[PDB]
Amino acid sequence: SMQIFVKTLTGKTITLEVEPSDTIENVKAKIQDKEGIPPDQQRLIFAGKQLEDGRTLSDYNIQKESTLHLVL
Amino acid sequence: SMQIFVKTLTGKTITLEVEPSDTIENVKAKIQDKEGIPPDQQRLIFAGKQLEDGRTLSDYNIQKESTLHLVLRLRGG
Amino acid sequence: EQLPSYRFNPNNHQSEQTLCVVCMCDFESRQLLRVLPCNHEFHAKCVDKWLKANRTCPICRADASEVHR
């Protein structure tokens, strides 16, 4: 279990509690819980790549205290 | 009177005491005093854009706790 | 190649610079540092390699073969 961060270009940074095995879809559901943004409106980027729903955080080498970008 | 942050060419971040009315020129002079880089070689970036000499922090909507990014003078071509 | 050099003492600083921007690693005790005429400091090994192909300070672009008045 770990924490990762999600930033909006102008927005604040939010903290998510996740696991390496969490899918991108899972992460979007977590963002929806906190921010109210529907998953279908969310595009997540990490390390120059758009993140795909079926993949997990570990697939992207996302680890403790990684920061993701949310684009709407 | 407020303080902002500059991420310098050493990757370290320094704190500056400024006024919303201070010009970019003034800010670069304060950076020079700490970092020893002449204003002519400094390029400051905020919100993805260069900050031009002659304008003020307030002109750019730069508030307290804002972070400016220092890179080297550049030109497209 | 004759530019001043000295060995870093973390307990006695001759300047305010802690880090080499070429390798992005800290100055450590006894490391040989090279100081350009503009007063910017680096590991000698790192900046000497840059100065073989280039005349300029990585930080300020000042010409290292000229004196900055």
Binding site: K49, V71 | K7, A47, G48, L72, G77 | M24
Partner: protein, 146 residues
């Protein structure tokens, strides 16, 4: 080179900029992908632009090779995504991390050089019909970058 590149991968992770993101492709530390968010209050606003980055084996003594994958309308960036910018060539300095390079490129979008352009026709439109330039840049952002 690899130690310096790993540092920067770490520099980004400890202090990620809101404007850009970058990291290796397929765990190859010499080949990265990046994103730049178009600056707000510009024709590129709202756009997400993708780039490729290839670090030379002698980095940081030579600059990274950086190019856009996303089409973008600009006097200094051509139809292949090649960026003609001094810090990527003669004015390179090892003090510039890939984070500072990406921020520098972002800052180029609203600060073109139309006098020594990579794309002369776009430079002419920029200087002589700026409203048309802005229109086209906004339309390309909407089409390619969103």
């Amino acid at each position: 080179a690899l130690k310096r590149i790993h540092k920067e991968l770490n520099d980004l992770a400890r202090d990620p900029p809101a404007q850009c993101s970058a990291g290796p492709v397929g765990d190859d530390m010499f080949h990265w992908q990046a994103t730049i968010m178009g600056p707000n209050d510009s024709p590129y606003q709202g756009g997400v632009f993708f780039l490729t980055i290839h670090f030379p084996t002698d980095y940081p003594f030579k600059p990274p090779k950086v190019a856009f994958t996303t089409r973008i309308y600009h006097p200094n960036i051509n139809s292949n995504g090649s960026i003609k910018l001094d810090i990527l060539r003669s004015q390179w300095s090892p003090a510039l991390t890939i984070s500072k390079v990406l921020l520098s490129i972002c800052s180029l979008l609203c600060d073109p050089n139309p006098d020594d352009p990579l794309v002369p026709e776009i430079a002419r439109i920029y200087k002589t019909d700026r409203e048309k330039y802005n229109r086209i840049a906004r339309e390309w952002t909407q089409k390619y970058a969103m």
